[PDB]
Amino acid sequence: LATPCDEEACKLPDCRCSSTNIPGGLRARDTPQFVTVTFDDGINVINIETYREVLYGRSNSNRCPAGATFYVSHEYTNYQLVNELYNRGFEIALHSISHRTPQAFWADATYQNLVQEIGDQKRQMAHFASIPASAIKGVRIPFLQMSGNTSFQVMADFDLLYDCTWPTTALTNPGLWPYTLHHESIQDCIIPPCPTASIPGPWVLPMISWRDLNNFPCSMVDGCFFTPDRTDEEGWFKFILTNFERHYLGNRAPFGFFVHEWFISSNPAIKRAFVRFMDIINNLNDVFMVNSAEVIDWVKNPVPIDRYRQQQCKFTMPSICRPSFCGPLTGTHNQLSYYMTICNTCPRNYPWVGNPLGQHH
Ligand SMILES: *[C@@H]1O[C@H](CO)[C@@H](O[C@@H]2O[C@H](CO)[C@@H](O)[C@H](O)[C@H]2NC(C)=O)[C@H](O)[C@H]1NC(C)=O
Numbered sequence: 024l025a026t027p028c029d030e031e032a033c034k035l036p037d038c039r040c041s042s043t044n045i046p047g048g049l050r051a052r053d054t055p056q057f058v059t060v061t062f063d064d065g066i067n068v069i070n071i072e073t074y075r076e077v078l079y080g081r082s083n084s085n086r087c088p089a090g091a092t093f094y095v096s097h098e099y100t101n102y103q104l105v106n107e108l109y110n111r112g113f114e115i116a117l118h119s120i121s122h123r124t125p126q127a128f129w130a131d132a133t134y135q136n137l138v139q140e141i142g143d144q145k146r147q148m149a150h151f152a153s154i155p156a157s158a159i160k161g162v163r164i165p166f167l168q169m170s171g172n173t174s175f176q177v178m179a180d181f182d183l184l185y186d187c188t189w190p191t192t193a194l195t196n197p198g199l200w201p202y203t204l205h206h207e208s209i210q211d212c213i214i215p216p217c218p219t220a221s222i223p224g225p226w227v228l229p230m231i232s233w234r235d236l237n238n239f240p241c242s243m244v245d246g247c248f249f250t251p252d253r254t255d256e257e258g259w260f261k262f263i264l265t266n267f268e269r270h271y272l273g274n275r276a277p278f279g280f281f282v283h284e285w286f287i288s289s290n291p292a293i294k295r296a297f298v299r300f301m302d303i304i305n306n307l308n309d310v311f312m313v314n315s316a317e318v319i320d321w322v323k324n325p326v327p328i329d330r331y332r333q334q335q336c337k338f339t340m341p342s343i344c345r346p347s348f349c350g351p352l353t354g355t356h357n358q359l360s361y362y363m364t365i366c367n368t369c370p371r372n373y374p375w376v377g378n379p380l381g382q383h384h
């Protein structure tokens with residue numbers, strides 16, 4: 024059971040307490056503003072068109088490729104398209120093998136449940152997308168449903184670096200910065216149960232809630248209730264930038280744009296506001312559209328804007344896809360049949376929970 028923070032024991036780069044103070048003792052105006060654009064759930068031939076259109080070719084003002092985090096769930100994911108996203112410099116993260124309903128399952132999952140749903144997905148993902156296992160570091164639990172200590176224990180066991188499942192509404196201005204779980208967390212638990220054990224090793228990357236038009240909090244853009252009309256491009260542009268300014272003109276805590284792709288392609292006016300927002304921050308000299316792992320990397324060794332701008336761009340190790348089209352595949356638990364596009368040789372059976380590489384019978 025974790026104790027309150029021993030500000031003398033908890034030291035970078037290995038340990039940090041839950042706090043709204045800027046890492047490294049930096050002043051806000053010397054602190055880079057990070058933006059983490061993220062997309063949940065399965066990668067397929069439809070939503071990849073949105074990702075190519077609004078993300079490809081972008082760069083930050085330091086000429087590094089602008090990043091984004093894909094919390095990928097396994098079912099109906101085209102792993103050749105995952106490989107493509109990885110090779111354009113975007114981060115591939117875990118969102119479970121099954122994404123199974125109901126949400127209540129994830130609140131209670133056993134250690135073994137999350138080993139098989141998340142821990143095993145790391146090698147599943149590296150295998151079928153043919154990307155370095157070391158590049159897989161992030162976790163978002165389905166339905167934003169925390170699992171107490173359990174998910175963080177699994178992360179420690181499988182060298183996953185950070186979780187981005189845990190929103191805050193009380194700690195948004197000044198915003199709560201990432202922290203480790205060596206000690207007790209001050210973060211509010213909107214979606215219980217939250218971890219209270221001392222679990223050294225993984226990081227919490229809080230989802231700092233947005234504020235909607237009536238000041239109600241929302242964790243994801245497509246979860247905001249009081250919102251401009253879907254056809255009102257200018258209203259959505261002002262809505263996005265107002266939430267962004269709360270960070271940029273505040274303590275500069277990482278600003279999230281957490282969405283499902285459906286919300287972007289279903290609403291062309293929102294997509295246009297979204298594109299304009301990205302165009303603006305790509306032209307700002309102290310704002311950076313990055314992968315979520317790069318936020319943890321900065322918190323671990325915080326540097327002022329001027330030195331951050333001198334750091335080398337992320338290194339994206341190229342990894343070729345040798346594509347295979349596989350099927351019909353079936354599983355022992357699945358009842359369904361499947362076809363798959365992967366960057367490896369075809370498995371004998373459908374990869375699933377308890378058989379993550381489709382290898383066994
Ligand atoms: C997570 O780990 C902590 C630390 O072991 C667990 O803490 C227990 O919490 C209950 C109250 O819910 C206390 O009655 C126990 O005494 C605590 N144990 C210890 C050793 O202090 C916690 O229950 C675990 N599970 C969850 C879901 O948080």
Ligand SMILES: [Zn+2]
Nearest residue numbers: 063064165166
């Ligand atoms: Zn999801």
